[PDB]
């Protein structure tokens, strides 16, 4: 009947930002007011659309992307941003129309000694295009000499682990993000 936003937000496991998930949302009427009225979301940014007018609008393609980043990196999930997440992990277009939702998940994604299940890409030969996704693990060549599949000097594994710990500051605490894209293209 209604849109299954609950399965996105209430998911037990979340993806790393480099391998960010995505679900289609279509052929359903959504109750967005139950989401942007909840104080559990410390970050609820909507771009190119009034949040209180979401139910008065119909869209062609509505996607729900979810991943986990550190608190200091939620700033990069926004139109026209730069940084390791915006460039090498998850890029939003300048004409992006939708909402960005993020909440602190320290009690779920941290552990004493470090949670290593979440990673993010720290090196890449070029920036990503909007909504591109790269999941390669090729050794990144910083210098001029080729690496030949051996990690070392100027030869890095491209993915960095967060190592989430509960005693970290909120900037380095885990945050789960959900990006609702509202695209008004030419389609039924």
């Amino acid at each position: 009947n209604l849109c299954p936003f609950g399965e996105v937000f209430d998911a037990t496991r979340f993806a790393s930002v480099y391998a960010w998930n995505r679900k289609r949302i279509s052929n359903c009427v959504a109750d967005y007011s139950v989401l942007y009225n909840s104080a559990s979301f410390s970050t609820f940014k909507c771009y190119g659309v009034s949040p209180t007018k979401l139910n008065d609008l119909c869209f062609t393609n509505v996607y729900a992307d979810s991943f986990v980043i550190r608190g200091d990196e939620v700033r990069q999930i926004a139109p026209g941003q730069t940084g390791k997440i915006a460039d090498y992990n998850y890029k939003l277009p300048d004409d992006f129309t939708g909402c960005v939702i993020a909440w602190n998940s320290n009690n779920l994604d941290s552990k004493v000694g470090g949670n290593y299940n979440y990673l993010y890409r720290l090196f890449r030969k070029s920036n990503l295009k909007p909504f591109e996704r790269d999941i390669s693990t090729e050794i990144y060549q910083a210098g001029s000499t080729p690496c030949n599949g051996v990690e070392g000097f100027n030869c890095y594994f491209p993915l960095q682990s967060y190592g989430f710990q509960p005693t970290n500051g909120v900037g380095y605490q885990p945050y789960r993000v959900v990006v609702l894209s509202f695209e008004l293209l030419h389609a039924p």
């Epitope: 390791k84 682990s161 967060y162």
Partner: nanobody, 126 residues
Framework: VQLVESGGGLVQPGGSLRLSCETS????????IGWFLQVPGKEREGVAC????????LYAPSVKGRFTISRDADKEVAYLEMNSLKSEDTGVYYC?????????????????????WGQGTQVTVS
């Protein structure tokens, strides 16, 4: 997590030095320890590099055989032995740490991947 450094100062061409790095608060299971040379007007370039669980090291070609990174008996202090000091070794030396995925190598010449940094200590070879 704080990294206090000590051991810098003025030294002779061909002299020795040993830098300290108080690894207090490091509560991660798998992490790296790196030493970085900061030259005025240059990118910060790592020279030494080790991971905790293994002790496996990694060095820069400019310092290979001359510098040596190690830890303490109680594993609370990280050291950087500096032998045969050239003038091109002059600059600020920071020790840094960061999470390192298990079964992977630490990264030296880049400062990326290191979250915690020391205040830095100047080493002038003259």
């Amino acid at each position: 997590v704080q990294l206090v450094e000590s051991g810098g100062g003025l030294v002779q061409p061909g002299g020795s030095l040993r830098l300290s790095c108080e690894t207090s608060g490091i509560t991660l299971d798998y992490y790296a320890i790196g030493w970085f040379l900061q030259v005025p007007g240059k990118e910060r370039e790592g020279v030494a590099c080790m991971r905790n669980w293994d002790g496996s090291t990694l060095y820069a070609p400019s310092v290979k055989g001359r510098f040596t990174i190690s830890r303490d008996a109680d594993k609370e202090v990280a050291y950087l032995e500096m032998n045969s000091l050239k003038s091109e070794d002059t600059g600020v030396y920071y020790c840094a740490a960061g999470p390192l995925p298990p079964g992977h190598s630490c990264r030296i010449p880049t400062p990326l991947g290191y979250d915690d940094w020391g205040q830095g200590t100047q080493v002038t070879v003259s």
